Amino acid sequence: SVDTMALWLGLRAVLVVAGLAVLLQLIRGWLSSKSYVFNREEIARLAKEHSGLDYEVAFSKIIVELRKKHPGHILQDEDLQWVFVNAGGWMGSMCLLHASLTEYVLLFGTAVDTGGHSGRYWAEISDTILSGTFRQWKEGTTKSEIFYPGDTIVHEVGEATSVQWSSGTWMVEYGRGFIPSTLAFALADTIFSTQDFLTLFYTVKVYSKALLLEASTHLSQLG
Amino acid sequence: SVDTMALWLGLRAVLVVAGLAVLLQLIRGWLSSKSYVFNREEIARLAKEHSGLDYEVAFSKIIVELRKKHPGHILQDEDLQWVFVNAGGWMGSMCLLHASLTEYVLLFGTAVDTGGHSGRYWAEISDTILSGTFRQWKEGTTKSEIFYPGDTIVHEVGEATSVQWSSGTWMVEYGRGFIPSTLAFALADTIFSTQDFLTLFYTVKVYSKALLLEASTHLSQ
Amino acid sequence: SVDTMALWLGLRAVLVVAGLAVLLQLIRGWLSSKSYVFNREEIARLAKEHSGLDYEVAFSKIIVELRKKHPGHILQDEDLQWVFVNAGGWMGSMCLLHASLTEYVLLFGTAVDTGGHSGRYWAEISDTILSGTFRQWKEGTTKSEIFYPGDTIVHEVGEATSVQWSSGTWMVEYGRGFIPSTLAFALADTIFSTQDFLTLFYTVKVYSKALLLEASTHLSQLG
């Protein structure tokens, strides 16, 4: 009886703490900057246009088209690198092309069967599949949905789902919102599971390089 | 030679610390309360009786029967909610019906293929399959076992295994023992992997509501 | 505008911390002790010779041959135990036969489909398959390779990959280098995911027993 009351009080404390955390995340999402360089429809159309070719040729053509359409906002060939991404129980790899305080663009995918938590979104993400399959299991439902090359899954602000990718699944991902808040999730398993400090090095390095490119382009466009 | 001695001393320290942790868990489990509302055979039979229907109809009928035989011990329809559960490398979802200091009842399952650590049990758990398959790989053996709808897997007090569930696997779970000790494992991956603070919110909220229902029924009785 | 600079500075802090960690791991791995009892080719051939039999008979014969060719360096039958191993998102089981400050030998495998991060290697590992399949996805590439019984996968000093094992995959693993540096990765999921303190107990116990056996053999060979 007394232990039950103590447990209920502790659970209520954890409840209000977690609620405060979620509210602070929502506040940082709301009060974030809304200066956007790209649009989700643009990236979706550009990725869907090349979804029928081989995924490597699609990567190359999409990178060339992005550098053509937005000069100074895409990393150079010397800065492109495949970096592992372990998060929410799943493992894939990314190649970052653009990343700012409010937007990011990358090529994400896995060559093996994987799956796990989508990650509690607090920014808007869009994934247009180039190859493979994407099984999404939304919250509150007991059934999943499959998406194929050409489809574009939009992960909204409040959504959390179960993601699963078959072997050889590759897609182009564009994220809009409070981008730094995603880093934590993208590195969670890197910190407490894989102990891969060199992957963390590569991730923070490519993010810092993208931020430096954005600042340099800003200065060159106001200079 | 010296680094070997330092490593051995560190290993012995970790050994005694882990042993003390296990001893504290065992002591809190044994000297825990044993006031039981349900029995594992009751829940097992109730789930096996409706395992042949569709799993949603089975959920509905099992909830109705539980409210009929135990009215003040099952959450209301307004309090039922599917909450994600990330633990031991696997991901599923639960709907809690009953939960006290010594017992809990829920509907657990996944719509995708998943698997991982069963979690070092320090309470007794029972899962009666309604749909899908349950692959259990016990500790110390090199072979696994498959379980189908109608079967009931009993996770004993000391057992730790490797669990795996195929897509669309749904079952009814009843646990008796030191329930708070399970929260740690049930929230480990929620804390250090998914960063899903809202799922933690939902979990602690439904547990607090179940405890409140139990306390209200106790006070009214 | 200012937040971009602040975020870049924070990323530089994380960058230099991770770089120091990687450099310290490389330096502590280098200039390390070089007292080696086994060689990867010996273990590879011993396992490949018995890869055609049942994996349990193969385990037994390999243990007998290891005790025959290297007496006093393999644990006794009373000290052999199957211990779960949760790491990098995957889960298997091990039976440790030899383990020192510079080398370790064990029988590793899983009875279920599993996979995840290989673990950022800072020691040289070799896995010779007795049964099942081993899918390895090296870093920087978008395609994986499958290995079958008889094959030997060599995880080099700097490599990090994605490992995947099908149900019933069993192999003999020999690791050479700075063995303690692997311990962290071997226990990460045990600490922050499974909460399995008894598996941690078993792991540290068998490692201490292997170290004690090695020290006893050293003393008996100089005594």
Side-chain angles (χ1 to χ4, degrees):
Chain A
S1 296
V2 181
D3 303 335
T4 302
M5 160 177 57
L7 178 61
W8 185 89
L9 291 175
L11 288 178
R12 278 292 168 174
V14 179
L15 186 283
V16 293
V17 170
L20 293 159
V22 174
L23 178 60
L24 289 180
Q25 288 299 321
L26 280 178
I27 290 179
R28 270 184 166 86
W30 283 328
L31 297 174
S32 176
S33 178
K34 296 179 177 181
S35 59
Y36 297 145
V37 175
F38 305 94
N39 286 329
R40 67 172 184 184
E41 303 287 343
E42 167 191 4
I43 303 297
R45 288 302 176 271
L46 176 55
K48 186 182 180 62
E49 179 182 355
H50 301 263
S51 60
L53 303 172
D54 184 71
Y55 64 88
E56 294 176 326
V57 185
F59 288 156
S60 184
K61 298 183 83 64
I62 289 174
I63 291 177
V64 169
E65 188 75 8
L66 284 177
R67 295 179 181 175
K68 176 183 178 182
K69 298 313 177 61
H70 296 268
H73 297 150
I74 308 299
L75 290 177
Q76 304 280 11
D77 290 333
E78 54 182 343
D79 294 323
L80 298 187
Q81 176 184 352
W82 288 108
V83 180
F84 275 146
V85 176
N86 291 73
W90 53 260
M91 175 179 183
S93 73
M94 73 168 182
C95 176
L96 185 66
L97 312 176
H98 164 270
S100 64
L101 192 67
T102 59
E103 286 173 322
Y104 77 88
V105 179
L106 47 79
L107 315 173
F108 173 76
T110 176
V112 301
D113 302 319
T114 191
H117 207 271
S118 55
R120 200 80 206 191
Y121 290 104
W122 280 291
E124 172 139 328
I125 313 295
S126 62
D127 299 82
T128 303
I129 309 175
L130 300 189
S131 63
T133 50
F134 194 151
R135 179 180 292 268
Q136 181 191 41
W137 174 22
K138 291 190 174 183
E139 184 181 4
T141 184
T142 61
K143 301 182 182 62
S144 61
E145 293 190 355
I146 314 295
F147 298 84
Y148 304 103
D151 294 357
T152 295
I153 305 96
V154 43
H155 307 273
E156 292 171 5
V157 164
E159 274 209 341
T161 63
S162 177
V163 294
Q164 186 168 342
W165 303 290
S166 61
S167 184
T169 304
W170 299 93
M171 57 190 61
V172 183
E173 178 174 330
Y174 164 76
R176 162 186 293 184
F178 197 45
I179 307 308
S181 62
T182 66
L183 280 178
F185 167 72
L187 301 170
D189 286 356
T190 303
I191 297 300
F192 298 100
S193 179
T194 72
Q195 308 292 328
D196 189 330
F197 301 137
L198 193 48
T199 290
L200 169 62
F201 183 94
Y202 291 149
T203 305
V204 299
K205 179 182 178 183
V206 299
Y207 197 10
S208 63
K209 285 191 173 181
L211 292 181
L212 189 66
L213 170 66
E214 287 302 311
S216 178
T217 300
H218 193 246
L219 264 57
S220 300
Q221 286 183 349
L222 65 88
Chain B
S1 296
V2 181
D3 303 335
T4 302
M5 161 187 57
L7 178 61
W8 186 89
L9 291 175
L11 288 177
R12 279 292 168 174
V14 179
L15 187 285
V16 295
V17 170
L20 292 160
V22 174
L23 177 60
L24 172 64
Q25 287 152 332
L26 280 179
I27 289 180
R28 273 182 168 173
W30 277 92
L31 296 174
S32 177
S33 178
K34 295 180 176 181
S35 59
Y36 297 146
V37 175
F38 306 90
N39 58 93
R40 69 171 185 86
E41 302 190 355
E42 168 190 4
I43 303 297
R45 285 192 301 267
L46 176 56
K48 186 182 180 62
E49 179 182 354
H50 302 263
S51 60
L53 302 81
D54 185 71
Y55 64 88
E56 294 176 326
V57 185
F59 288 157
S60 184
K61 298 184 83 64
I62 289 174
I63 292 177
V64 169
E65 186 74 8
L66 284 177
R67 294 179 181 176
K68 177 182 178 181
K69 296 312 177 61
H70 297 269
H73 298 150
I74 307 299
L75 290 177
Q76 305 279 12
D77 289 333
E78 54 183 343
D79 295 323
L80 298 187
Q81 176 183 352
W82 288 108
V83 180
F84 274 146
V85 176
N86 291 73
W90 52 260
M91 174 179 183
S93 73
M94 72 168 182
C95 176
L96 186 66
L97 312 176
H98 164 85
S100 65
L101 191 67
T102 60
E103 286 173 322
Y104 77 92
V105 179
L106 47 79
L107 315 173
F108 174 76
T110 176
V112 301
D113 303 319
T114 192
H117 206 271
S118 55
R120 199 80 206 191
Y121 290 104
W122 281 291
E124 172 139 328
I125 313 295
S126 62
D127 299 82
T128 303
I129 309 175
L130 300 189
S131 63
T133 50
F134 194 152
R135 179 179 292 183
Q136 182 191 41
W137 175 23
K138 291 190 174 183
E139 184 182 4
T141 184
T142 61
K143 300 182 182 62
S144 61
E145 293 190 355
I146 315 295
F147 299 91
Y148 304 103
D151 293 358
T152 295
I153 305 96
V154 163
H155 306 273
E156 291 171 5
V157 164
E159 274 210 341
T161 63
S162 178
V163 294
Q164 186 168 343
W165 303 289
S166 61
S167 184
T169 304
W170 302 94
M171 57 190 60
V172 184
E173 178 174 330
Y174 164 77
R176 49 167 47 185
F178 197 44
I179 307 308
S181 62
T182 66
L183 281 178
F185 167 72
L187 300 169
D189 286 356
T190 303
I191 296 299
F192 298 100
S193 179
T194 72
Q195 308 292 328
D196 189 331
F197 302 137
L198 192 47
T199 290
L200 170 62
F201 183 96
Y202 291 150
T203 305
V204 299
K205 179 182 178 183
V206 299
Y207 196 9
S208 63
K209 285 191 173 181
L211 291 181
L212 189 66
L213 170 66
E214 287 302 311
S216 178
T217 300
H218 194 65
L219 265 56
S220 300
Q221 286 183 350
Chain C
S1 189
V2 181
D3 302 335
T4 302
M5 161 65 57
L7 178 61
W8 186 89
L9 291 176
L11 288 178
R12 273 289 170 173
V14 179
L15 186 80
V16 295
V17 171
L20 173 87
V22 174
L23 287 175
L24 288 180
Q25 289 299 322
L26 179 145
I27 289 180
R28 197 166 289 166
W30 216 5
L31 297 174
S32 62
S33 178
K34 296 178 297 180
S35 59
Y36 296 147
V37 175
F38 306 89
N39 58 93
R40 69 171 185 86
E41 301 287 343
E42 168 191 5
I43 304 297
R45 282 301 175 270
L46 175 55
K48 187 182 180 62
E49 286 171 1
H50 302 75
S51 60
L53 303 172
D54 185 71
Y55 64 88
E56 294 176 326
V57 185
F59 287 156
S60 184
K61 298 184 83 64
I62 289 174
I63 291 177
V64 170
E65 185 74 8
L66 285 178
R67 294 180 180 176
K68 176 183 178 182
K69 294 311 177 61
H70 298 268
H73 297 271
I74 308 299
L75 290 177
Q76 305 280 11
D77 290 334
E78 54 182 343
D79 295 323
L80 298 187
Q81 176 184 352
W82 288 107
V83 179
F84 275 145
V85 176
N86 291 73
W90 53 261
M91 175 178 183
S93 73
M94 72 168 182
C95 176
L96 185 66
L97 313 176
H98 164 86
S100 64
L101 191 67
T102 59
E103 285 174 322
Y104 77 89
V105 179
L106 46 80
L107 315 173
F108 174 76
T110 176
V112 301
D113 302 319
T114 191
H117 206 271
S118 56
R120 199 80 206 191
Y121 290 103
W122 281 292
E124 172 139 328
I125 313 295
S126 62
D127 299 82
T128 304
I129 309 175
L130 300 189
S131 63
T133 51
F134 194 152
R135 179 180 292 183
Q136 182 191 41
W137 174 23
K138 291 190 173 183
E139 183 182 4
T141 184
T142 61
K143 300 182 182 62
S144 61
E145 293 190 355
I146 316 294
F147 298 54
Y148 306 105
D151 293 357
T152 295
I153 306 95
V154 162
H155 306 272
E156 292 171 5
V157 164
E159 274 210 341
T161 64
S162 177
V163 294
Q164 186 168 343
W165 303 290
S166 60
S167 184
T169 304
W170 301 93
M171 57 191 60
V172 183
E173 178 174 330
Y174 164 76
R176 162 186 293 184
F178 198 45
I179 306 308
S181 62
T182 66
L183 281 177
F185 169 73
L187 301 170
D189 286 356
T190 303
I191 297 300
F192 299 100
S193 179
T194 72
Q195 308 292 328
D196 188 330
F197 301 137
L198 193 48
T199 290
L200 170 63
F201 184 97
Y202 290 150
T203 305
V204 299
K205 179 181 178 183
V206 299
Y207 198 9
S208 63
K209 285 191 173 181
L211 292 181
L212 190 66
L213 170 67
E214 289 302 311
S216 178
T217 300
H218 193 65
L219 265 57
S220 300
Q221 286 183 349
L222 65 87

